Design a protein around this ligand. Structure first.
Ligand code: D12
Ligand code: D12
Ligand code: D12
Ligand code: D12
Ligand code: D12
Ligand code: D12
Ligand code: D12
Ligand code: D12
Lengths: 342, 342, 342
């Protein structure tokens, strides 16, 4: 909601209040899930070419008691400059360039978008990331955009890995970089490829699974969007990058996602999708499946401010020594929600 | 404060900044008490009959250091639909229907409203609560309203009680339901009754006091409001529902509250009230008093945005083995405050 | 940004999003430093003479993971009344009157302002502080202002020191008071003096260094501001008030700060400053330096909403047994930032 516009400067106070409930045999996901988001977006005019911006986004959980702890966190926070034609530059806590392509399939009612995690190198939201983007290849080629980003090291809490912003091994990282490229081929058809590479840290190599100096990703995608039809698919291959439960990293893995949906003029929007993550050579566990399920659900829009939804996750995983040790869930889940947004 | 209204949608950013100070011989309540609340309220027009809404409210303490922890929590968070005549429906973190009646006496300057607590079954604010309300009995009877709500189970943090939203025994609960009914008899005279009942959990029965399968409440109230006079009283009887300090639950107890106040045209609003909670059969402690005091204070309004107040709690409890073991306070308290609200 | 003004009441929603990065050999300060501030300011008209106000300010860090803890805190929170001529009165979490003078030198791009800390008696931000201020000596003398404040005791977490708002020894305090006086001599020349005195607590005297019943400060300052020139200096002498690393308090110490800067009409604002804190009689460590460095940097303004900066701290301290035991840093630091504010 735009709440201020005057003298070259403008503001946006936005967010949502989601009433969620989960139904599952898995006791650590079953129950109330209500939460809420709050955010701010700014834009200031400097010249006829230069223009500054900034954005912050917060997540506040509302399913526990008034005495509970660690209930809220920050998802995004950054500042940048926009140069009209030559592109844009920003820095802070933001999305890794890999998401530029993998977001094409992150469009389910509740689930989905989980063959990666956050603070997982440059695959999703991350700390201290400098980003440069260019739009229609300067004004020349239409619909051809690309980006280049660098991320500094986020070490341990003490010892030598250490950096002021210390976290645990599964969320650490060394210096790295990545780039993406997308193109609008013709009518509602787009294609894209993105690559990333970064240094691993000492603590990471002293973990149960995974061994290497570098962490890498190669990802390509395709998408169709027109005439109330949405069709998208993504494929990505990783080397010492995707987490294997709580045990460590997969030496090599292959991820695949597919989504399809239709938009009825009267509000209903049914959806069907499928996804899986397969790991190879897991230090004595051989070849295992890390994630695998079929999702079926639908969402109803009252208007651009209110909606309801139902989502149904059908788990295809088999209970075994691996899933048990890694802490990976194998049960089904059903979500039901009511949400208001401004 | 309404900060946005345009195209069928409207917003409210509200709250307050309270400068509080407590004077007491009880060392764990004596001292600075400054805090602040922030909230948001929305409303979107859908049809000539349908209309969606949402509300969030946060509490942020300001009496400790910039390095202290667990200083802020969420009080309310929910979304609903309003059907014009047929009523309304909402879900999330909200008030239990019992408060529909007991709030009649929760009108003191600082103290009062404490024969119950929060996250105490359906007596005050609680997690994951679905609520349906109907206004003038459809349009037919004027001033006759009622409500019906259901609350899902909020288990332990692990083991089998467990649910994703795990908390400790004194704040757990099983599936339950409750209803309330209020009626405007004539000139500034209202009456109301509310009943609730819910399942208890394993962990709750392994506590020092209290034993049972169900937790129940029966509450009735009366109120007079007109000609600058305010008179209200509430009576409620519980079974395995009211907490007995930190030891467990009272097998049966009786709660009573009375408040009276006058509003001078020039701003001053003096107040006098009295309340007590009496417990029966406390597993070897017999019959004891759980709470008991007389309150006298007054508040001054500069306008609808600023005010000052003083409150004086006169504790009638006697120091003994019970109050000592349960952790119940027996000293007096004096509050003094300055508050600004928007 | 003023987002509401109507019917005698007005609101301000303000803040900033700062993209920061530190470069240092000191591993506990090196790395990402991104954070963000959010605040609210209100003002309500009561009479032709009376007028109420309120302010809150929050700090939210954005350089760690979505699972990290203790990432946000409250800096200010208070309410007051303004009496037109006779002055003003407010209470809550606010600045100590000593800052009225020492702020004259707290104007560096990133560093500086550190010969004191927060929750350090009445030298910076503190809990439960009642403040009275008077402007032009009632309307009589122009540019001559003064203030008088009292701060209640902030004890320990338990035992007898205890108060509801319990914190650790280095941040405790007893009852105290302080006053300041400033005067505008002539053209862009001001001078000021401020004094404070408060009782120490038991826990504070059982610390490794420092011994006394009272904590005191005597501070005087001078400033020149005109024709794009800024010149300021501050001197203050303490008795059992300035912290000596993590070991305790200095029995007596002397602090000195100097800053100088020039404002080019086209946006650039270079700056040079120097500061040091010298401690005397440190229970067997003799006379030591507690802080000492030279700072050189500059900031560029795109407009009243966007800016960039670089800051360079040149540490003059020598590595020794003292600095090592107290936990005092001896390396250099370089900051680089991009910031948007509203
Ligand atoms: C058997 C019908 C029961 C009807 C109960 C109506 C409750 C109205 C309460 C009015 C209190 C003054
Ligand atoms: C006009 C006064 C109406 C008060 C209603 C009292 C109802 C008492 C019900 C007792 C049920 C046990
Ligand atoms: C549904 C209406 C029930 C009316 C019961 C009135 C009981 C009043 C008791 C007041 C106790 C302080
Ligand atoms: C006009 C007030 C009528 C009060 C009626 C009271 C009915 C019995 C209430 C019993 C409460 C324990
Ligand atoms: C005219 C005032 C009527 C007040 C009624 C109080 C009812 C108290 C009920 C106590 C039941 C044990
Ligand atoms: C208007 C005030 C009504 C007061 C009714 C007295 C009820 C006393 C209840 C005592 C419960 C043990
Ligand atoms: C409604 C307020 C009445 C206050 C009367 C106080 C009487 C104190 C009696 C104490 C008995 C233990
Ligand atoms: C206006 C006078 C109201 C009197 C109400 C008396 C209630 C006293 C309660 C004492 C319980 C022991």
């Amino acid at each position: 909601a735009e709440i201020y516009n005057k003298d070259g400067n403008k503001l946006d106070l936005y967010g949502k209040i989601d009433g969620l409930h989960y139904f599952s045999d898995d006791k650590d996901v079953d129950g109330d899930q209500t939460y809420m988001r709050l955010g701010v977006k700014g834009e200031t005019q400097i010249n006829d070419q230069l223009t500054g911006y900034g954005q912050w986004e917060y997540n506040v959980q509302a399913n526990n008691t008034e005495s509970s702890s660690d209930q809220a966190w920050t998802r995004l926070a950054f500042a940048g400059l926009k140069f009209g034609d030559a592109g844009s530059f920003d820095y802070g806590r933001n999305y890794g360039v890999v998401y530029d392509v993998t977001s094409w399939t992150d469009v389910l009612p509740e689930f989905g978008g989980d063959t990666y995690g956050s603070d997982n190198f440059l695959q999703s939201r991350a700390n201290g990331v400098a980003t440069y983007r260019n739009s229609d290849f300067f004004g020349l080629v239409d619909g051809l955009n690309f980006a280049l980003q660098y991320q500094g090291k986020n070490g341990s809490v003490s010892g030598e890995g250490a950096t002021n912003n210390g976290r645990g091994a599964l969320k650490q990282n060394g210096d790295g970089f990545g780039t993406s490229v997308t193109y609008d081929i013709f009518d509602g058809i787009s294609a894209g490829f993105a690559y990333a590479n970064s240094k691993r840290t000492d603590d990471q190599n002293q973990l149960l699974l995974g061994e290497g100096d570098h962490a890498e990703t190669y990802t390509g995608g395709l998408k169709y969007d027109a005439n109330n039809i949405y069709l998208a698919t993504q494929y990505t291959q990783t080397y010492n990058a995707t987490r294997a439960g709580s045990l460590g990293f997969a030496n090599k893995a292959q991820n695949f996602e597919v989504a399809a949906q239709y938009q009825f003029d009267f509000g209903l929007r049914p959806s069907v999708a499928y996804l899986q993550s397969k790991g190879k050579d897991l230090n004595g566990y051989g070849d295992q499946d890390i994630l695998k399920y079929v999702d079926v659900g639908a969402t109803y829009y009252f208007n651009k401010n209110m909606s309801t939804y139902v989502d149904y996750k059908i788990n295809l995983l088999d209970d075994n020594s691996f899933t048990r040790s890694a802490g990976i869930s194998t049960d089904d889940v059903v979500a039901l929600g009511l949400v208001y947004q401004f």
